[PDB]
Amino acid sequence: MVTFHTNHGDIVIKTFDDKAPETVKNFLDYCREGFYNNTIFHRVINGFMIQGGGFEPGMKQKATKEPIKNEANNGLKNTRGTLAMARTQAPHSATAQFFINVVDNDFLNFSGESLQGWGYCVFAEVVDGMDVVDKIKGVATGRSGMHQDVPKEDVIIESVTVSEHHHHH
Structure with missing residues (x-):
C-alpha cells in the first residue's frame, strides 16, 4: 500500500505487483527516494483523468531514470480509480509520471503490441480517498x-508513505 499525502487529503493505493512487476518496482523506487515529494498534479481534466509525478511547482520538471517497459499487455483495464503510467509516443517511454482514471477510459486500453495498440499500463488502484x-x-x-x-492553484503531492503487511503461518 502507498499513500499519497496531497494538499487535498490522502490517496491510498494498492499496487498490482504480479501484473506489472517492473512498473510497480519503478514506481516504489521513486516513492522511497523522495522523487514524488513536492511534485504536482500538473494535468487535470475532469471526466478524464488527473496526471502528476513529473513537475515541481513552477512547471519545474525533475530529471528521471531510464524509461521502463510498457506492461499494458497484462489484461488490466483503465477503469475509474486505476493508476496507469503516462508516456509519450513510444510505448516503452514511461518514466515517473502517472495518472488516475476518473472515469472508465476504455480507449487507453492495450489492444496489441504496436504503436497504436500498446495503450497505457495499469499498475495500481485507489482503495481509499477517491473523494480526494x-x-x-x-x-x-x-x-x-x-x-x-x-x-490554477497547485495540487501538490507533499510526500508518500509506504505500508507493508507481512503474514506468517
Missing part, C-alpha cells in the same frame, strides 16, 4: 507555457 481524487479532478485549471489543464 474527485475533489482534485474538479479544480479550476488554465494554461502554463506549452502546457494546458494546469491547476
Whole structure:
C-alpha cells in the first residue's frame, strides 16, 4: 500500500505487483527516494483523468531514470480509480509520471503490441480517498507555457508513505 499525502487529503493505493512487476518496482523506487515529494498534479481534466509525478511547482520538471517497459499487455483495464503510467509516443517511454482514471477510459486500453495498440499500463488502484481524487479532478485549471489543464492553484503531492503487511503461518 502507498499513500499519497496531497494538499487535498490522502490517496491510498494498492499496487498490482504480479501484473506489472517492473512498473510497480519503478514506481516504489521513486516513492522511497523522495522523487514524488513536492511534485504536482500538473494535468487535470475532469471526466478524464488527473496526471502528476513529473513537475515541481513552477512547471519545474525533475530529471528521471531510464524509461521502463510498457506492461499494458497484462489484461488490466483503465477503469475509474486505476493508476496507469503516462508516456509519450513510444510505448516503452514511461518514466515517473502517472495518472488516475476518473472515469472508465476504455480507449487507453492495450489492444496489441504496436504503436497504436500498446495503450497505457495499469499498475495500481485507489482503495481509499477517491473523494480526494474527485475533489482534485474538479479544480479550476488554465494554461502554463506549452502546457494546458494546469491547476490554477497547485495540487501538490507533499510526500508518500509506504505500508507493508507481512503474514506468517
